[PDB]
Structures are given as structure tokens and as C-alpha cells.
Design goal:
The structure is cut from a larger assembly and holds nine protein chains of nine kinds.
Chain A: H1 3-9, H2 42-48, H3 59-71, H4 81-122
Helix pairs in contact in A: 3-4
Chain E: H1 2-18, H2 36-49, H3 58-69, H4 75-100
Chain I: H1 26-50, H2 62-72, H3 83-117
The chains are: A mainly alpha, B mainly alpha, C mainly alpha, D mainly alpha, E mainly alpha, F mainly alpha, G mainly alpha, H mainly alpha, I mainly alpha.
The structure holds cardiolipin (CDL), ligand PLX and the ligand CCCCCCCCCCCC(=O)SCCNC(=O)CCNC(=O)[C@H](O)C(C)(C)COP(=O)(O)O.
């Protein structure tokens, strides 16, 4: 989707632009924001030679999965817990990205409406 | 080896869709003189066939029975 | 195996071919059912999809339209 | 309609001639007068080529730099190296989101 | 794709050789009972080609479609991909319906 | 290199003193031995040439050409004795004498240290060719073909001589080593432009260049089999050798004087490849394919880069072998049915299987199937041209398509289909023809094994 | 393929050819047999409705209109027999057809095998050689002064005659040679 | 293997089988030498239908110029025997 | 009544749709008779040599020889310089040459000008 229908048919001014996001400072409405941490060191990721796309914030679960897959090689059904853990981390990352997009949407609409209301109040 | 053709008089259009075709042609005053030539396609072992969904679910009964017995064995095997 | 022409009859079928056909259909269906019973999430999804509307403003961090 | 007597007669004669010619194409019983262990396949078709190939690779091709290259094996935290015997540390006190 | 495509072609070849080198589907009647093994093989192949879950076609086609849907992609290509994956099932059931179901239409010397 | 020249001069009286029924045997045996001896010229250096004396020398460009000439002579001897069976003994000895004289002239041509001796021998090759074509050709058109072969060449080569002697009066030498070491740039004047044109037009007409090629279908179609063989395989390459030699004194004029010739070569390879598609004559198709390949070689030489030179040498050798093989293959069918029309005798794969195999191999080699040396030369030329200008890949690409088409077209029309009903005089292939085809084709693949031997001095 | 063609097709031949083509294309449209029988009986009644038209001009006009209807409603992909000129196995076995005169060039070692066949082949060759001149003379007498007007050939009429121009008709390679 | 070696007797039986299956032809009267127009009293459309029936029976098409000439079952047997290289 | 079929060069008119065949005359029948007579005379001439037991070799067909000679050797004697011939010759023989010359000259001029200012990204261009 409905977001495509809203942006392409409705008012595109209050709909986020995927290529240009975010627009507002990261600490705009938040008073303080915790910095996102990592678990896997650069050297560990390089030694594991994961990929340039799999070196995301869920890379440590992926390294654990690769270890278990190598160790329990002939039994290729034994790598179930770690695969689920990696999938859960990826799902949480996607939820965080969805939160980011929705925050962009609400902030853009709120700021635009507030600016329009301020202009209206100054117009009378 | 040394096989002969079946007796030609056993081919009839009774009980076949050719009966319906002949019935509709007779109501128009026409006739179909070739139906007995086509009767063999409906007469014998070609008399009945499955549908599309029936064709898709060919080995469903035996597979379902095997799946059920496997699941039942699995449930009363973890009680060890 | 010797099979001879029939001339407007159903062809001769040996028990072996029907046995093989029924067997392979049965194993395909058993595999599908077993893999669905044990690996269901591969078709129905694993993680619940959130809905952005039910997200409170406090965790989201935008001001109440004043500042 | 149909044939004329000349066509019918010519067809009959030609058909008889053709059938005679076809009958002559058959072979008498003596016509082709010709004038005057178990697992050995896996040895002569697998073992010998692999012997030759391994000899060539291990004693001729690998005698020059950069002819056979293997990518570096994956190393993961907690692994022990064969040559040096060193160990690689674990991974930063997992948050345990159980 | 290699597996089930090659096997579909092989089933078609068996059908062609049996019916005196005939390739038109309009002259093939009821081969569900006349050809048990060939019918079963073609059914499994058509189901695998159409992404029946947990068969060989599912594990690639399902992922491909789901990854096309979740990407910053041209919308027209997405629509055409969906219509094409429906038409795949369409021509598969066309082959099945005209080749195996109904009454015979081939010459009487079986 | 008198160790190669003298044995041919001795081939002469041996042929003229042999018994009446042993001429072919002795000629073939001793020509093969001379080819074996000449094979020793391939031991070349990486810096300079082999300067045997003040008169003769060998580079890495001329040695494969000499080997090709020596190997070709016995092939023409084998292919010739079929249709010369009814000829008298003296005329047969004269024919063999013509072939031997042509080989001697070519051998001395490819190794002369001075440009004027090279000129003398490279014109001396004209006489045996004209005699062969105009005397032992089959149809009435041969006479006209001879004329078209003669003056087209001479009108190109007479200016060159003038330029040559003029150069000798200004630089003081025509020795190739002195010419190379004392090279000086050419200024931008009309006199220098016409000197360039005079030095270049002879070798352009010999290739031939598109627009200057009308003599080639006539000469190659009306000649006997040995004449066509030596015309296509060796005599066309004299232009390439001469241009790669003479271009050392023409810089930097070529930088802009190659433009009309490059345009003619590219559009003409397109045009001749398209011409090949509608050809009722089987020999004319091979002639026009030769024209297209030589157009590619002309482009390679005019670009003047090392990769282009290597590609030019490789393509020269490969085309010589392939075109000779194709001419022999067509001549077998002509000797059977006495006609050159391509759609007359069809379905010959049914009647002559091994000859169909030879046809397929020759056609595959013609269209530059990798890793044949045809493909190596073509690809090197295309890469050099792409470095020259990125748009050439269009035209060359076009050629790479059309060639294959007409190639397969010829095959499909001559070997496939159903046989002609009324032709019933098609005898099984002789051992002589099969051996001829094998001796044509095997050196090509052997050269594919070791291709550095034919990549020239730029390697 | 076996009959000598005539100068033109008459009205009845054209009507019969249209009848056959329309029936075949309707069979292509009507896949199933009972439906085909229904619509084929309808088409036969439609054809024989005007069977008794004495005005040839109106008959030709009806034939024309029928042909336009056929070309409009023809099947783009009609059924073709596998060995018919549009079939999938039309000329499949032509590459296996070898003429008999090739046997004349077999090596004597190759002819040493199959001696009886080559004896019969010599018999057939002698028969052809002995009959050729009689065939030629018969053709000359029967043929009209102004050359033949059809492609039809005459049969044998005399005691031991053979129908002229028979060698390449009788000695066809085969339909399934190899 | 492949199909059996079709013979003249088999061809004749199949042709008579197809013809006796026709409602416009009475079986007892029909013989191998019966004339479609004269003895059997049919018209040209019926002959075309008969030819199509034989084409469907034997699975190969008879050209129109040859199909129009065939008038008796013996003629059809001879034509099919010649087309399929049948000599026994 | 139904939508009409209009022919073209590469998809001609059917024989059964041709109005010229549906209005005939005795002259047309006579012409067809002459056509068959010519065809039959030629067929008899061919079949006489085709079936000859003593014939060995190729039956020469004058029509094939005429086709080849017309396609190859007869073209120049029947050529005349006309405005159409001259214009087509000039176009088809000169236009491509100067078109390709302009294209390649422009490309090389652009490339050389870019080289002179030092911006062509010629790094790793060792071979040429
Ligand atoms: C890759 C294969 C590896 C094999 C290893 C050994 C190969 C040795 C080959 C040496 C050359 C053989 C002589 C060729 C002339 C033909 C002689 C002949 O008359 O045969 C009759 C003889 C008797 O049969 P018959 O009953 O008389 O049948 C006659 C009938 O007419 C029935 O006739 P037919 O139906 O039998 O027709 C003959 C058949 C075969 O005839 C031929 O085609 C011979 C010519 C081959 C192609 C020539 C045109 C292309 C030129 C490319 C140059 C490559 C040179 C390779 C090095 C050569 C060194 C000597 O035709 C074809 O199969 C079509 C050929 C299409 C080629 C497709 C592949 C293209 C090249 C692929 C790359 C090659 C290099 C691979 C390695 C690259 C890096 C990994 O049959 C044979 O001897 C068998 C022929 C099998 C040929 C295989 C073709 C593939 C190999 C190509 C070269 C291999 C190079 C080896 C080194 C490694 C590379
Ligand atoms: C059918 C195929 C056969 C083979 C064809 C061979 C092709 C040969 C063509 C020769 C290539 C170039 C020749 C002359 C070089 C330049 C040509 C000219 O157009 O360039 C300009 C020349 O300007 C004008 O064009 C003057 C020339 C005009 C008269 C020449 C006749 C051209 C008409 C076409 C005749 C066709 C010739 C081929 C006949 C078959 C350059 O300007 P400019 O800077 O001043 O001169 C440079 C020399 N300087 C430095 C000494 C001063
Ligand atoms: C699939 C869609 C395409 C199908 C569309 C086709 C539509 C065509 C339907 C209309 C055709 C007609 O009615 S046009 C009918 C034309 N009528 C006449 O010509 C009358 C003169 N009669 C004769 O010529 C002969 O009696 C003859 C009838 C030949 C019988 O011959 P025989 O007795 O000696 O066998």
C-alpha cells in the first residue's frame, strides 16, 4: 504494498524516498541513542572470508553456522539451531529497518504538517 | 503372433456419447453413418478414465498410509 | 517380455510396470507429506510480520507536534 | 471416374514386376559369406589415466610457481592451526538472546 | 531444472515412439491407463516444474519468486514474471489434459 | 641457403632425364625430401635474422612461407597427375618444369636481402603462372583470365620499380638491414604522398585490395588445379610479405594514408562475404572467400601494431592451407561430373562419406573455428583493430557471421539433401585424393599444436 | 504421386477437394470424435443442400464464397500426417536411400559375399537390356506426331513385352531402406 | 521391436473391416470387387468419406489425385500395398 | 462477409482465393492444354534418356546452363549506363565508404583529442 499506492497516487511529499533516507538527524527526536555494536572482529570476518554482503551485523551467527556445518559435515541435518539463530538475527535486522522507514514516514509527515500549521498561524 | 481382428458386429453406439450425437442429428433429420467406426474408442478398456484432479492424486492413498504409519512410529519412539 | 498388437483393444499390461508406477507415485506423495509435516515453516513462513501502525511513539522517538 | 483400362493394365504389370523385384531382395541362408576379464575396465580406463595424470601433476606441473593454486582455507574462531599449533580466540561474549 | 526438463523430454519421446512416431497431441487419447509408468513420470515432472512444494523445482523457483518480490525492481518485470509462472501451470495442464485424459484418438493398430 | 636452392635446380634435370613412367614418382619423392630439408629454417632467433651471405637472409616471417612453398609443390604434383594422364611425356615434363621454376623463384624471392632483387624475382614468378593458366586451363575464358592476371599486376608493379631506384639514389642503399637501421621520417608533401602510393599499390593489387580484385576470380577459376592451388596458397602472400617489409620507410605518412585502404578493406570484406551467398559457381565462392581473408590481412598490416602483424602472418599461412584444400575438394567433384555448378550434384555425403568428412573439416577450418590458427590470426587482427577504433567491432562482427553462413551453405548444398537421380558415374574416392586431403589438413592441426612458429618476428 | 495429372480440375473435383479440406480442418478444430461426427454431419448436409443446382454460374459463386469462408476460418496449425509434406517425419529416411547402380562399383571381395543376389541382379540387368529396344519402339508407334499430350504411358500388349519405362519405377530403393 | 511386417491379407481384412462398419453399405452384399458407384449406389461425397476412413485406419494420407481414382476395395488394397512396399 | 485477406510480396495470394481462376474461358482451357503438352514433351524427353541402359554420365540440362550463363556471363553485354543505373551505382558503391570514413575519422579525432589533455584512463594498456 500500500505504500507504493500512497506515494505514487497520493501525496508524494509526505512519503519517504528509499534512495534518500534518512533525512532527519539520527538523534533528532531521540534524546540519546545507543550506538549499534558488533560482535565479529574485522580479522575474524576476513579469515572466515564470508562475503562482502554477509559481513553485516549478524555475521557472528553466520560464522557459528559455518563452523557447525564444517564440523558436522556428513550429517547435513545437524545444523538446525544455528541456522535458526542466524535467521532470527536477520529478521530482527529487517524489523529494525522497517522501524527506520516508518520513523522516517511519521517524522516527515509530522514535520511537514507542523511547518504548514506554523505558516498558517503566521498567515493570519 | 498370429492375431486376428475382433468381430465387427460387437461395435455399437448404445450408451456412448455417439448415442447423444445420433439423437441430436435425428432431431434435425440428419444421420451419422460412421459412429460404429468410432465406437471402439469407448467400447472396451477405454470405457472410463480419471479426471485431472484424480490424475494428480494418483499415489495419494499409499503415500498417506505410509506417512501416517511413519508419524505414529515417530510419536511413540521419543518415549524412550 | 513379449507383447503383441491388439487392434482396437486396450494394450496388454504387465504387473511390473503398474507396480513401479504406483510405487513411485506413492513415494512422491509420502515425501511431500513428510517434508510438510516436518518442514512446514518453509511454506507458511517462520517469523511474524509486524504492522507499523501499532508502534508507539516513545520507542519511535518523534515529538508530540509541538517542538 | 476411376482408372482407364490402359492405366489398370499398366499398374498391374508394374506391380507384378515390383513384387518380383522385392522378392529378389531377400537373402538366402548363406548370403553373408564372411571370409577368414570381469573388472578390467576400471583398470584400463580409470586407474592408468589417473596414474599418468597424478604423475604429470605432482612431478611436472607443480615444478613451477603458480601453476596449481588453491584458495586459502577458511579459518574460524576457536580453530587450531596445524603447522604453528596456535589457537584463535573465541567471539566476544555472545549477548545470549535466548 | 536439468533433471526434470530432461525427464519430461524423455517421457515425451517414449510417447512419440509408442504411437508410431506421432507428435501431435490431438491424436493422443487416454494414456493414463495405457501408460502407467510414463504417466506417473510426466505427472511428477509437471508438478516439479510448476513448483510443487518440497519437490526439486520448489527449492529454486519459490526462492526466485520470493526474492523478486522483495527487491527494488522494475514493476513491469515483476508482473510479467508472475503471469509467466501462471502460464507455466497453464501449458503443463494443457499437455496433461490432451495427452493422457479422455478417449483414444490414435490409429486402431495399438 | 644454397642447400635448398641447389636441390631444386637439380630437380630440373632429374625430371627431364627420368623414364617416361617414373616422372611423377621421382618428382614427388625429391620434392618431399627438399621440404624436409627446408623444415630446418624454422630455428630462428629472437633478436635478428639469419644472414647467410650478402645476398640471402631469413626472418621469422619468411621461413614459414618457404616451408609452405616447399610443402605445396608435392601436393600440386599429386593433384595434377589425374587429369594429365592422356598428355604426352614431353608436355608432362614441361608442366613439372613450370612448377619447379615457380618454386625456385618463390624460394629466392622470400629471402632476397635487397629490395631490387626481391622485385626481380617477385615479377619473375609471373611467367610460369601465366604459362600454366593459359596452356593447361580447360575453358576458353582462360586466355582472358591470363590477361587480367598479367596487366593488373604489372600496372601495379611498374611504378614500384621507379620508386625503388629513386630511393637508391637518395639513401645510397636498398639492403634491408641498412634501410631499417638508417630509417628517416617522411615529411608531409605531395612528393612523399606519391612515393608512398607507388611503394604501396603493387602489394595492394597483389593481395588483392577491394576494387582491385576483378582479376582474382578469373585467374582462380579458369586455371588448372595446381595453378589455382599455388595462386591461392602462396602467390597472394607476396603482397603481404612485401608490404610488411616496405612499411619500415613510410612512417609517419601511413598514420593518415591508410584511411582509404582501411575503408575499402572493411567494406569490401563485407561486400565479398555477401557476394559469396549467391554464387552458382563453386570455385568462385572459394575465390571470393580468399578476397575477404586478404582484406582482413590488409587491415592488419595497415594498422601497424605488433599484434596486427602477428595476426597477419598467422592468417596468411592458415588461409593458404585452407584455400588450397578447398580447391582440391571442389576439383574432385569437377573431375567426377565435369561441371562446376554448385547445385548440379547434390547429396554426395550419401555416396562419398570420407570425402564428406574432408569437406566438413575444410568448411569448419574456413569459418575460423577455435583453436585453429585461422581463428588465432582473425582474433589477433580483430583485437588490434578494436584498439585502433572501437567501432570496427561492428564490421568485423558482421563478417564473422556472414562467413559462417556461406561456408555452411556450400556444405549443405553439396553434401546434404537427396542425390541427383540422373548422375550415375560417381566412382569411389581414390587413395590419391584421400592422401591429398589428409596431407592438406594434418599440418594445419600440427601448427595449432605449436603456433609460435607462424606468428612472425613480432613474437 | 502415381497418377499423371490433367490440364485442369473440373467443378466436381474442386468441390470434392474443398469438402476434404474443410472436413480435415474441422477435425483439427473439433479434437474429440463425437463432436467431430456431429459437425461433420452438419457440414455434409450443408454441402449437399445445394447439390442440385443447375445454374453453373451460381454453383461457382457458392464455391467461391465457401473458399473465402474456409480461408477465414481455417486452423493455423492443422493436423498433418507424420510422413506428409508438412509432417515431422516427411523426408526422414531419404538419406538412407542409395541407388542400385552403386552396386556396380563394389569391389570383387565385396561381391564375393552375397553371390546369389548378384546372380539375380545380373538376371535383371539382362532382362532390362533385352527389353529396352522393344519398349522404345512401342513408345514411338503409340505416341502422337505432335508429341505426347499427357504424361501417361502405355502398357504391354504383346507376348513377352514389358511396360515401357519401368526400370526406375520397379527398382525403387525402398520406403524404409536401412 | 517395431511394427510387424504388414501383409496383403492384413490390408484386405482391415479395408473390409472399415467398409463393413459403414451404415450406408450392407455387409453381406459387399465383396472385395464391389464398385462403390455401380454395385453399392453411393455418391462422390461418400467416396471421399471412405477415403478419409482408410487414411485414418492406416495412418497415412492418400493424395487427392490418387484418391479419386480408387473405386473398389481391391483397388485400395493394391494402392496401399504399393505405397508400403508390401509383396507378401 | 468475413474479414478479407490481402496479399503481399512475402505472403502471396492463395490459388483458391484467386478471382482469375473463378472466371474461365475456352481460351484458358486451350492455354492450359498447351502448357500440359509442353510439360509432357519435356518429361518424355527426360525419361527417354533417364531409363537408357547404355547411358553413363550426366544428362545435360540446357535450362541449368542457361540459368548459370544468364546469371554470370550475360550481365555486362546487356548493361547500359542509365540515370537509375548510375545513381544506384554511385550510392551503393560510394556512400558506405564515405559514411564509414566519417564515422571512424570522428571517433579517432575524439580519442586523440582526449589523449592530448591527458584524460583517457589508459592505465594497464600495455598491449596494443
Ligand atoms: C576434444 C576431443 C579430444 C579427443 C582427443 C583425441 C583427438 C585427436 C584428433 C586428431 C585429429 C584427427 C584427424 C582429423 C581428420 C579426420 C580423420 C578422419 O577421416 O576420420 C575417420 C575415422 C574413421 O571413421 P569412418 O568410419 O571412416 O567415418 C567416416 C564417415 O564419414 C563418418 O565420419 P564422422 O561422422 O566420424 O566424422 C568425423 C568427425 C571427426 O573428424 C574431425 O572433425 C577431425 C577434425 C577436428 C576438427 C577440425 C576443425 C576445427 C579445427 C580446430 C583445430 C584443433 C586442433 C587440435 C589439435 C590437433 C593435433 C593433431 O567429425 C566430427 O566429429 C566433427 C568435428 C567437430 C569438432 C568439434 C570440436 C571443435 C574443437 C574442440 C577443441 C579441440 C581441442 C580440445 C582441447 C582444448 C583445451 C581443453 O574416424 C576417426 O578417426 C574418429 C574421428 C574423431 C575426431 C574427433 C574430433 C575432435 C578432436 C579434434 C582435435 C583433437 C585434438 C587432440 C589433442 C587435444 C585437443
Ligand atoms: C577502386 C579502388 C582502387 C584503389 C584506390 C586507391 C585510393 C588512393 C587515394 C589516395 C589517398 C589520399 C591522396 C592525397 C592525400 C590527401 C587527399 C586530400 O583530399 O587531402 C587534402 C588535400 O586538399 C585538397 O583535397 C587538394 C586535393 C584535391 C585534388 C585531388 C583529386 C581528388 C579527386 C578524386 C579523384 C579519385 C582518385 C582515384 C581515381 C581512381 C589535405 O589538405 P592539404 O593540407 O591541402 O594537403 C596536405 C598535403 N600538404 C601538406 C603537402 C599540403
Ligand atoms: C473449419 C472452418 C472451415 C469450413 C468452412 C467451409 C464452408 C463451406 C460450406 C459451403 C459449401 C457449399 O455448400 S457449395 C455447393 C456447390 N454446389 C454445386 O456445385 C452443385 C452442383 N453439383 C455438383 O457439382 C456435384 O453433384 C457435387 C456436389 C460436386 C457432388 O458430386 P458427386 O455426387 O458426383 O460426388
Amino acid at each position: 504494498g500500500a505504500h507504493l499506492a500512497r506515494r505514487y497516487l497520493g501525496d508524494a511529499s509526505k512519503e519517504p524516498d528509499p534512495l534518500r533516507m534518512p533525512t532527519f538527524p539520527p538523534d533528532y527526536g531521540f534524546p540519546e541513542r545507543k550506538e549499534r555494536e558488533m560482535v565479529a572482529t574485522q580479522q575474524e570476518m576476513n579469515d572466515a572470508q564470508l562475503m562482502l554482503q554477509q559481513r553485516d551485523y549478524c555475521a557472528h551467527y553466520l560464522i557459528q553456522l559455518l563452523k557447525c556445518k564444517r564440523d558436522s559435515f556428513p550429517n547435513f541435518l545437524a545444523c538446525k539451531h544455528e541456522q535458526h539463530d542466524w535467521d532470527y538475527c536477520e529478521h530482527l535486522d529487517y524489523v529494525k529497518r522497517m522501524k527506520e522507514f516508518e520513523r522516517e514516514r511519521r517524522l516527515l509527515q509530522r514535520k511537514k504538517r507542523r511547518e504548514q500549521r506554523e505558516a498558517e498561524m503566521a498567515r493570519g | 503372433s498370429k492375431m486376428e481382428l475382433p468381430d465387427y458386429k460387437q461395435w455399437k453406439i448404445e450408451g456412448t456419447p455417439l448415442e447423444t450425437v445420433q439423437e441430436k442429428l435425428a432431431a434435425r433429420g440428419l444421420r451419422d453413418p460412421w459412429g460404429r467406426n468410432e465406437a471402439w474408442r469407448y467400447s472396451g478398456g477405454f470405457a472410463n478414465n480419471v479426471s485431472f484432479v484424480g490424475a494428480l492424486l494418483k499415489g495419494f492413498k499409499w503415500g498417506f498410509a505410509a506417512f501416517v504409519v511413519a508419524v505414529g512410529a515417530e510419536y511413540y519412539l521419543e518415549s524412550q | 517380455v513379449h507383447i503383441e498388437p491388439r487392434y482396437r483393444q486396450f494394450p496388454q499390461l504387465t504387473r511390473s510396470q503398474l507396480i513401479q508406477a504406483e510405487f513411485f507415485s506413492a513415494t512422491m506423495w509420502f515425501w511431500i507429506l513428510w517434508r510438510f509435516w516436518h518442514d512446514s515453516d518453509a511454506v507458511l513462513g517462520h517469523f511474524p510480520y509486524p504492522d507499523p501502525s501499532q508502534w508507539t511513539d516513545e520507542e519511535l522517538g518523534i515529538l508530540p507536534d509541538d517542538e | 471416374s476411376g482408372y482407364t483400362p490402359d492405366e489398370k493394365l499398366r499398374l498391374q504389370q508394374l506391380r507384378e514386376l515390383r513384387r518380383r523385384w522385392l522378392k529378389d531382395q531377400e537373402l538366402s541362408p548363406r548370403e553373408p559369406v564372411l571370409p577368414p576379464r570381469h573388472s578390467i575396465f576400471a583398470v584400463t580406463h580409470v586407474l592408468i589415466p589417473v596414474w599418468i595424470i597424478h604423475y604429470y601433476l605432482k612431478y611436472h606441473v607443480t615444478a613451477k610457481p603458480y601453476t596449481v593454486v588453491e584458495r586459502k582455507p577458511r579459518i574460524f574462531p576457536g580453530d587450531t592451526i596445524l603447522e604453528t599449533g596456535e589457537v584463535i580466540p573465541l567471539m566476544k561474549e555472545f549477548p545470549d538472546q535466548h | 531444472h536439468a533433471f526434470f526438463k530432461a525427464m519430461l523430454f524423455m517421457c515425451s519421446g517414449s510417447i512419440i515412439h509408442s504411437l508410431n512416431d506421432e507428435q501431435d497431441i490431438r491424436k493422443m487419447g487416454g494414456l493414463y491407463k495405457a501408460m502407467p509408468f510414463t504417466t506417473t513420470a510426466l505427472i511428477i515432472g509437471s508438478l516439479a516444474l510448476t513448483g510443487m512444494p518440497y519437490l526439486t523445482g520448489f527449492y529454486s523457483k519459490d526462492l526466485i519468486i520470493e526474492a523478486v518480490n522483495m527487491s527494488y525492481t522494475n514493476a513491469w518485470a515483476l508482473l510479467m514474471t508472475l503471469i509467466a509462472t501462471s502460464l507455466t501451470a497453464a501449458y503443463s495442464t494443457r499437455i496433461i489434459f490432451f495427452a493422457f485424459l479422455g478417449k483414444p484418438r490414435f490409429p486402431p493398430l495399438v | 641457403m644454397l642447400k635448398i636452392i641447389i636441390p631444386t635446380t637439380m630437380l630440373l634435370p632429374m625430371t627431364w632425364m627420368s623414364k617416361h613412367n617414373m616422372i611423377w614418382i621421382n618428382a614427388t619423392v625429391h620434392s618431399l625430401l627438399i621440404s624436409l630439408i627446408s623444415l630446418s629454417l624454422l630455428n630462428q632467433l629472437g633478436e635478428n635474422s639469419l644472414n647467410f651471405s650478402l645476398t640471402f637472409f631469413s626472418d621469422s616471417l619468411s621461413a614459414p612461407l618457404l616451408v609452405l612453398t616447399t610443402w605445396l609443390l608435392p601436393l600440386m604434383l599429386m593433384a595434377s597427375q589425374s587429369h594429365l594422364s592422356k598428355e604426352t611425356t614431353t608436355r608432362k615434363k614441361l608442366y613439372i618444369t613450370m612448377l619447379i621454376l615457380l618454386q625456385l623463384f618463390l624460394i629466392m624471392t622470400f629471402t632476397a636481402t635487397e629490395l631490387i632483387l626481391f622485385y626481380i624475382l617477385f615479377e619473375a614468378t609471373l611467367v610460369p603462372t601465366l604459362i600454366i593458366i593459359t596452356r593447361w586451363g580447360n575453358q576458353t575464358e582462360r586466355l582472358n583470365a591470363g590477361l587480367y592476371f598479367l596487366f593488373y599486376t604489372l600496372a601495379g608493379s611498374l611504378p614500384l620499380l621507379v620508386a625503388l631506384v629513386y630511393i637508391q639514389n637518395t639513401t645510397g642503399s636498398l639492403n634491408f638491414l641498412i634501410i631499417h637501421y638508417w630509417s628517416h621520417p617522411l615529411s608531409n608533401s605531395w612528393s612523399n604522398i606519391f612515393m608512398w602510393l607507388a611503394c604501396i599499390m603493387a602489394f595492394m593489387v597483389k593481395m588483392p585490395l577491394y576494387g582491385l580484385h576483378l582479376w582474382l576470380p578469373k585467374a582462380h577459376v579458369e586455371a588448372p588445379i595446381a595453378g589455382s592451388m599455388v595462386l591461392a596458397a602462396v602467390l597472394l602472400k607476396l603482397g603481404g610479405y612485401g608490404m610488411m617489409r616496405i612499411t619500415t620507410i613510410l612512417n609517419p605518412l601511413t598514420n593518415y594514408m591508410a584511411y582509404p585502404f582501411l575503408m575499402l578493406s572493411m567494406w569490401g570484406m563485407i561486400m565479398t562475404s555477401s557476394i559469396c551467398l549467391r554464387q552458382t559457381d563453386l570455385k568462385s565462392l572459394i575465390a571470393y572467400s580468399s578476397v575477404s581473408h586478404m582484406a582482413l590481412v590488409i587491415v592488419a598490416i595497415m594498422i601497424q601494431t605488433p599484434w596486427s602483424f602477428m595476426g597477419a602472418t598467422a592468417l596468411m599461412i592458415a588461409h593458404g592451407l585452407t584455400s588450397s584444400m578447398l580447391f582440391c575438394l571442389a576439383n574432385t567433384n569437377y573431375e567426377r561430373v565435369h561441371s562446376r555448378t554448385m547445385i548440379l550434384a547434390r547429396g554426395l555425403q550419401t555416396l562419398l562419406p570420407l570425402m564428406a568428412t574432408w569437406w566438413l573439416v575444410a568448411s569448419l577450418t574456413n569459418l575460423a573455428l577455435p583453436p585453429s590458427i585461422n581463428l588465432i590470426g582473425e582474433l589477433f587482427i580483430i583485437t588490434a583493430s578494436f584498439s585502433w577504433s572501437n567501432i570496427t567491432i561492428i564490421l568485423m562482427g558482421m563478417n564473422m557471421m556472414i562467413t559462417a553462413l556461406y561456408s555452411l551453405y556450400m556444405l549443405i548444398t553439396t553434401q546434404r539433401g537427396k542425390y541427383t537421380h540422373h548422375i550415375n558415374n560417381i566412382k569411389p574416392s581414390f587413395t590419391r585424393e584421400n592422401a591429398l586431403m589428409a596431407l592438406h589438413i594434418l599440418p594445419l592441426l600440427l601448427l595449432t599444436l605449436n603456433p609460435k612458429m607462424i606468428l612472425g618476428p613480432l613474437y | 504421386a502415381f497418377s499423371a495429372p490433367a490440364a485442369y480440375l473440373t467443378h466436381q473435383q474442386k468441390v470434392l477437394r474443398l469438402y476434404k479440406r474443410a472436413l480435415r480442418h474441422l477435425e483439427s478444430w473439433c479434437v474429440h470424435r463425437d463432436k467431430y461426427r456431429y459437425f461433420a454431419c452438419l457440414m455434409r448436409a450443408r454441402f449437399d443442400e445445394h447439390k442440385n443446382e443447375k445454374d453453373m454460374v451460381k454453383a461457382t459463386q457458392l464455391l467461391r464464397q465457401a473458399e473465402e469462408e474456409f480461408w477465414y476460418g481455417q486452423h493455423p496449425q492443422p493436423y498433418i500426417f507424420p510422413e506428409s509434406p508438412g509432417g515431422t517425419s516427411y523426408e526422414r529416411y531419404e538419406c538412407y536411400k542409395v541407388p542400385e547402380w552403386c552396386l556396380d562399383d563394389w569391389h570383387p571381395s565385396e561381391k564375393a559375399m552375397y553371390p546369389d543376389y548378384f546372380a539375380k541382379r545380373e538376371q535383371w540387368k539382362r532382362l532390362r537390356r533385352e527389353s529396352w529396344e522393344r519398349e522404345v519402339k512401342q513408345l514411338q508407334e503409340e505416341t502422337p506426331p505432335g508429341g505426347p499430350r499427357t504424361e501417361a504411358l502405355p502398357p504391354a500388349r504383346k507376348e513377352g513385352d514389358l511396360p515401357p519405362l519401368w526400370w526406375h519405377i520397379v527398382t525403387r530403393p525402398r520406403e524404409r531402406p536401412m | 521391436s517395431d511394427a510387424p511386417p504388414l501383409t496383403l491379407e492384413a490390408i484386405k481384412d482391415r479395408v473390409l473391416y472399415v467398409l463393413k462398419l459403414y451404415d450406408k453399405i450392407d455387409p453381406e452384399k459387399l465383396s472385395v470387387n464391389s464398385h462403390f458407384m455401380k454395385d453399392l449406389g453411393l455418391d462422390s461425397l461418400d467416396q471421399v468419406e471412405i477415403i478419409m476412413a482408410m487414411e485414418d485406419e492406416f495412418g497415412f494420407e492418400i493424395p487427392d489425385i490418387d484418391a479419386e481414382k480408387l473405386m473398389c476395395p481391391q483397388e485400395i488394397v493394391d494402392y496401399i500395398a504399393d505405397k508400403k512396399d508390401v509383396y507378401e | 462477409s468475413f474479414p478479407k485477406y490481402k496479399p503481399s510480396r512475402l505472403a502471396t495470394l492463395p490459388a483458391t482465393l484467386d478471382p482469375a481462376e473463378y472466371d474461365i474461358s475456352p481460351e484458358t482451357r486451350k492455354a492450359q492444354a498447351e502448357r500440359l503438352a509442353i510439360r509432357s514433351r519435356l518429361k518424355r524427353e527426360y525419361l527417354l534418356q533417364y531409363n537408357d541402359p547404355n547411358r553413363l554420365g550426366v544428362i545435360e540440362d540446357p535450362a541449368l546452363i542457361r540459368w548459370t550463363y544468364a546469371r554470370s556471363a550475360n550481365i555486362y553485354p546487356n548493361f547500359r549506363p542509365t540515370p537509375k543505373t548510375s545513381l544506384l551505382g554511385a550510392l551503393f558503391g560510394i556512400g558506405p565508404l564515405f559514411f564509414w570514413y566519417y564515422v571512424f575519422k570522428t571517433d579517432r579525432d575524439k580519442k586523440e583529442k582526449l589523449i592530448q589533455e591527458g584524460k583517457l584512463d589508459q592505465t594497464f594498456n600495455i598491449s596494443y
